[PDB]
Amino acid sequence: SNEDLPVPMENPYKEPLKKCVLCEKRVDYKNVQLLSQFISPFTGCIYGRHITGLCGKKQREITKAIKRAQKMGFMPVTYKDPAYLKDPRVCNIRYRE
Amino acid sequence: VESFASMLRHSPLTQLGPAKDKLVIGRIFHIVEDDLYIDFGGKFHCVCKRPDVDGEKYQRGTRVRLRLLDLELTSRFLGGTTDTTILEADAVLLGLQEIR
Amino acid sequence: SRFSLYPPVPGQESSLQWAGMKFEDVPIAHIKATYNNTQIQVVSATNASLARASCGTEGFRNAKKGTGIAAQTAGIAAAAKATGKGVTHIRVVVKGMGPGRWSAIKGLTMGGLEVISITDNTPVPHXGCRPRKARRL
Amino acid sequence: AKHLKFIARTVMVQEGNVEGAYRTLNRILTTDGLTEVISRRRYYEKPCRRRQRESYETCRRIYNMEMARKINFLMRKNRADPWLGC
Amino acid sequence: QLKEQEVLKLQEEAKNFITRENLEARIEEALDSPKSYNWAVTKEGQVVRN
Amino acid sequence: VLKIRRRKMNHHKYRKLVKR
Amino acid sequence: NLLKKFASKTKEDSIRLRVLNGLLYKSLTELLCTPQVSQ
Amino acid sequence: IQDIFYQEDQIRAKFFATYGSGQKAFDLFNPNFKSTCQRFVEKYTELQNLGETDEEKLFVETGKALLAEGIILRRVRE
Amino acid sequence: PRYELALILKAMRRPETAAALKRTIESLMDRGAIVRNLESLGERALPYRISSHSQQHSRGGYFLVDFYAPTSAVENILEHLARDIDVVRPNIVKHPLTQEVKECDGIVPVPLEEKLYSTKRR
Amino acid sequence: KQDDEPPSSAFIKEYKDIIPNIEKVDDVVKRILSLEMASRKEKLKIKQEQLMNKIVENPEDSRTLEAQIIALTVRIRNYEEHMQKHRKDKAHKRHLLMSIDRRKKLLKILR
Amino acid sequence: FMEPYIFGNRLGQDIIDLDQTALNLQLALNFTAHVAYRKGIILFVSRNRQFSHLIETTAQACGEYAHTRYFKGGLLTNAQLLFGPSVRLPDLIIFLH
RNA sequence: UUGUUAGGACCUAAACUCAAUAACGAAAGUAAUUCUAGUCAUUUAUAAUACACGACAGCUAAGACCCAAACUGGGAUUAGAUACCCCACUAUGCUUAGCCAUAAACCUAAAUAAUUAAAUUUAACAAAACUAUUUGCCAGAGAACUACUAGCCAUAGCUUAAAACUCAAAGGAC
Numbered sequence A: 001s002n003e004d005l006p007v008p009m010e011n012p013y014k015e016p017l018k019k020c021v022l023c024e025k026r027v028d029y030k031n032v033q034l035l036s037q038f039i040s041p042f043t044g045c046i047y048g049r050h051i052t053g054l055c056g057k058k059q060r061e062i063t064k065a066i067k068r069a070q071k072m073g074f075m076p077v078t079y080k081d082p083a084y085l086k087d088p089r090v091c092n093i094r095y096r097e
Numbered sequence B: 001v002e003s004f005a006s007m008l009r010h011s012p013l014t015q016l017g018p019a020k021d022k023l024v025i026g027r028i029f030h031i032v033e034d035d036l037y038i039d040f041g042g043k044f045h046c047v048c049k050r051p052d053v054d055g056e057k058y059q060r061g062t063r064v065r066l067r068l069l070d071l072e073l074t075s076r077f078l079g080g081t082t083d084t085t086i087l088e089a090d091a092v093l094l095g096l097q098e099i100r
Numbered sequence C: 001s002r003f004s005l006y007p008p009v010p011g012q013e014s015s016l017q018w019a020g021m022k023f024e025d026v027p028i029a030h031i032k033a034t035y036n037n038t039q040i041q042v043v044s045a046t047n048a049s050l051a052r053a054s055c056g057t058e059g060f061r062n063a064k065k066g067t068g069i070a071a072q073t074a075g076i077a078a079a080a081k082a083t084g085k086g087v088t089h090i091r092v093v094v095k096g097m098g099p100g101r102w103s104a105i106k107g108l109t110m111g112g113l114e115v116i117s118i119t120d121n122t123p124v125p126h127x128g129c130r131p132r133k134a135r136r137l
Numbered sequence D: 001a002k003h004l005k006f007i008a009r010t011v012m013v014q015e016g017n018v019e020g021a022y023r024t025l026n027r028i029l030t031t032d033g034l035t036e037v038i039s040r041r042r043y044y045e046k047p048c049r050r051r052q053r054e055s056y057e058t059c060r061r062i063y064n065m066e067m068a069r070k071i072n073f074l075m076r077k078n079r080a081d082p083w084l085g086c
Numbered sequence E: 001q002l003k004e005q006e007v008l009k010l011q012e013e014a015k016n017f018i019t020r021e022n023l024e025a026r027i028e029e030a031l032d033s034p035k036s037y038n039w040a041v042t043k044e045g046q047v048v049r050n
Numbered sequence F: 001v002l003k004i005r006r007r008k009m010n011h012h013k014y015r016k017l018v019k020r
Numbered sequence G: 001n002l003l004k005k006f007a008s009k010t011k012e013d014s015i016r017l018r019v020l021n022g023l024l025y026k027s028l029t030e031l032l033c034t035p036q037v038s039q
Numbered sequence H: 001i002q003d004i005f006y007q008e009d010q011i012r013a014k015f016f017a018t019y020g021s022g023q024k025a026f027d028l029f030n031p032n033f034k035s036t037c038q039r040f041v042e043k044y045t046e047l048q049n050l051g052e053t054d055e056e057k058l059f060v061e062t063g064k065a066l067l068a069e070g071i072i073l074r075r076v077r078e
Numbered sequence I: 001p002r003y004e005l006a007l008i009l010k011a012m013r014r015p016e017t018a019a020a021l022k023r024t025i026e027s028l029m030d031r032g033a034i035v036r037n038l039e040s041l042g043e044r045a046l047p048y049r050i051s052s053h054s055q056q057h058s059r060g061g062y063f064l065v066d067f068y069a070p071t072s073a074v075e076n077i078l079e080h081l082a083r084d085i086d087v088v089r090p091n092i093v094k095h096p097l098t099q100e101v102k103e104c105d106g107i108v109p110v111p112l113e114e115k116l117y118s119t120k121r122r
Numbered sequence J: 001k002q003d004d005e006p007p008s009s010a011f012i013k014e015y016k017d018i019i020p021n022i023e024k025v026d027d028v029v030k031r032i033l034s035l036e037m038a039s040r041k042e043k044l045k046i047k048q049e050q051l052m053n054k055i056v057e058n059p060e061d062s063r064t065l066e067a068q069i070i071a072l073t074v075r076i077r078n079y080e081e082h083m084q085k086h087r088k089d090k091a092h093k094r095h096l097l098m099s100i101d102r103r104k105k106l107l108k109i110l111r
Numbered sequence K: 001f002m003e004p005y006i007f008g009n010r011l012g013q014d015i016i017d018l019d020q021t022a023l024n025l026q027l028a029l030n031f032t033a034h035v036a037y038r039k040g041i042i043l044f045v046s047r048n049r050q051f052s053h054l055i056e057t058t059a060q061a062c063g064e065y066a067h068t069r070y071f072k073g074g075l076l077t078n079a080q081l082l083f084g085p086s087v088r089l090p091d092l093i094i095f096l097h
Numbered sequence L: 001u002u003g004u005u006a007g008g009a010c011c012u013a014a015a016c017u018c019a020a021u022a023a024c025g026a027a028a029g030u031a032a033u034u035c036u037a038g039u040c041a042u043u044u045a046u047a048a049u050a051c052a053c054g055a056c057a058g059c060u061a062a063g064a065c066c067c068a069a070a071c072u073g074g075g076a077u078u079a080g081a082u083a084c085c086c087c088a089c090u091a092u093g094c095u096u097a098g099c100c101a102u103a104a105a106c107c108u109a110a111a112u113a114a115u116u117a118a119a120u121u122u123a124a125c126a127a128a129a130c131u132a133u134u135u136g137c138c139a140g141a142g143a144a145c146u147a148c149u150a151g152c153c154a155u156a157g158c159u160u161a162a163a164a165c166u167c168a169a170a171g172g173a174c
């Protein structure tokens, strides 16, 4: 009929979905340096997923690892260890104005 | 006579592929204060702001360079059964095209 | 080469000294700011009491005992007692969230003491004791 | 009670600006939600009321974000009239 | 094939398991070499071991 | 509206009567 | 139903009003001494 | 509604992922405009008519042919 | 199954620390275990002050012991280690390596409309 | 009790037919892959397989009514052992009574 | 009700079959000619303000009428009150928009 | 008594942030940590006179007891306070064994498989509509979550559930 008619196919130009910072990375309770990047420096409170930027799965993984680390004598509870204050910033939170 | 299906396949707009982060040439057809209305060959025009450098050069008929983002700005909002369109395109004016 | 809001880390070497004292040595001003009375106690870094004051001891009574100006007087009174004992720099640990929480710290400054840091120790239970029932008014 | 004292919830005064230190400590304790927690924990909120309150906040936050999105989506179309006289 | 390989891998790994004979020697090797599980990520998702 | 109030008021008068 | 819900287009008094006035003042003063309401 | 996808789009998608959009700007007012990407697809087709069956072979050979033509193709991973 | 022990030990000199790790690992073997690896993480300051056996501790030596044991031995091991006077805090968990990092494509956009079907009902 | 209980030296169902082929395997490796270092769930997969061989004509098929009945007898006897220790577990007491009733329904269709 | 006329969706932008457009446009132009031939009144109607002056200039060139402004309620259903007792309504309305 | 304690003891009770999450369970219900046990295939719908469960409050017995708190006492308030507010304190909330079987036990939606067009706002409002299958249930309101009856560890209890008589309405959504 017509050679120029469009051909059914999956979108070639499809854009890959957006991954979180921890996508496909092991989250362990002993890696307190990674865990400390998602708590508050002053209170030690876990940040929500609107701050950490994580997905549901990794948000739950970090939460379960911080609590296990805190309960097994690896991580503090009421603050962030001063030795990890220098690590990079991944969380969308600015205490200073 | 060429068929419509052939025309669409070989059309410059069909060749562009996705219009995000593409480079295109536009023409200024309407100016309102420091807002330039630029036709880049699509359905909807874009509207950019006159650059501080060489502001006087951007007059009507002047061909410029653009970085497309969307061909039409549209978005569905809560409680809407159809998309809300502002009947405008999104592009970033980069500067005048060298006549050469 | 910038100021750090975070306090010095205990057990490390720092260049920050106040009146030839390290951070761990600077005396502590314990402010208990409740909704009725604001108490203040100043202690040395070895936990020895030096000054004490409160809105009640100043002479305020009942609802006046729980105002901002009442706590300010208590801080100025605690400062004067502390200044006599030989205290120039204090670490302010403010427990409680009452009306004279800030005013007590402002009185201490007016009394001639130099605050170098402000800590908060308001009790926050992690799940704890059932609070009293809501008031119906 | 078992942790180290003066690391948690401690700000440092810069150049004797004792008020600025306190005002920053307040912004910290509020951003972290400790302020609301201490206020609400004065009296007992019953489990049924806590769930009603949290469901309302979530729906309130969703509606305030979408309405802001609609206003910000049409922020650019608010410009000088190009077709004045028509 | 997969299960045969998995069994063989465990057999090779079992060479270096601890036993009563090599307990004290393996204890001293562990004390000599500390290990670290700490690492951090950037906003780009890149590990940053120190 | 008045139907639960009436069940309540009717139920209230039965519990009082049972007590007497 | 969110849009429907949140559009929302459609001597006793003397002693009671001496307690609400005092308490509301006590409470609103505390609200404004923190960033809780707003910065 | 049929999604309009021609067979050239498979080639065009690879070109945009490997080299991005040609540094020359698209002119959508010229009805017969030939972009750098459309020339890549015209040469890629010619080689495929000869009978090359490997997509990798057709992608690197077309790049060499355009390099001889003088077109500046930058393999921008960024 | 495969379990990872997390053994915080009292801060001691190497002679006594080595004796503590020999006595400990021997107990695992006596309970029918197959010890696979021993790792040290170093002496450090505890995140908080842990009180064990009528002594307050601020520093301890962190160690990991990878091993296999029946499901019935896990409880007996923890009971024995809790009675040891050189053990600040023993914690047995299922070995992390037995758990495999899942494969994720990405975050698919969720329409808020299908979140007000979720949240309005809640 | 029942006539057959899997020995502790038996290999798990994944490696039941793989280790015999391997020429030589260490005692430790056999012990890691035995039923001593496995969960109770693994020991139940061996009990079921033993019964399927001894009863079903074609043990390869597990969708037959006779095979489904065998699957529920292992679960039923498992829930009973659970309930002998957890006397006040009401979720598992329900699981036991619902499987018993399920087995009766399947035995009725088979008959 | 427009899906019959849409050739397809080119990466989010619906494309309009120009073969149906030619057939429909032929009928519409033929009908517009017979109406104009018989001396009927033709009213061009649009509310797009970019093309308000162009459409008013076109109507004047043709010899017909244009209404590109705010449309009063009742203009056609209550025309006698608005325009007069014997006002003749349009015989054809061309909606550019 | 108070404040401080980087002093000691206790291991009672409850589980911040995470949670802007929407998972698990038949429902009730369930989110401190770890480990053990553990949810799984009947084609699908359809069950009581049987079996097993069932928030909170309450009963029985032995314990626990930080805090909260019916009742009770004290203080104030008011023409009166038998309440609201303040202080003290008990049953009770907890554990171990039973019992009781009640909720606006509500998503005020029986389950299951369809379809989205039948020119279906087929009242309105909720939650778009609608077909088929099977069971349960309903037939004006009040009298009546009542009387009597039978069953039940329930004894001021629960489930089951009328009539006389009265009215011309009751009721629902806007």
Ligand code: FES
Pocket (backbone or CB within 6 Å): A018, A019, A020, A021, A022, A023, A024, A054, A055, A056, A057, A058, I104, I105, I106, I107
């Ligand atoms: S987006 Fe892949 S794990 Fe978070």
Ligand SMILES: [Mg+2]
Pocket (backbone or CB within 6 Å): none
């Ligand atoms: Mg307890």
Ligand SMILES: [Mg+2]
Pocket (backbone or CB within 6 Å): J039, L037
């Ligand atoms: Mg298990």
Ligand SMILES: [Mg+2]
Pocket (backbone or CB within 6 Å): none
């Ligand atoms: Mg009591």
Ligand SMILES: [Mg+2]
Pocket (backbone or CB within 6 Å): L106
């Ligand atoms: Mg409900």
Ligand SMILES: [Mg+2]
Pocket (backbone or CB within 6 Å): L145
């Ligand atoms: Mg009842």
Ligand SMILES: [Mg+2]
Pocket (backbone or CB within 6 Å): none
């Ligand atoms: Mg009755």
Ligand SMILES: [Mg+2]
Pocket (backbone or CB within 6 Å): none
């Ligand atoms: Mg009866």
Ligand SMILES: [Mg+2]
Pocket (backbone or CB within 6 Å): none
């Ligand atoms: Mg009747």
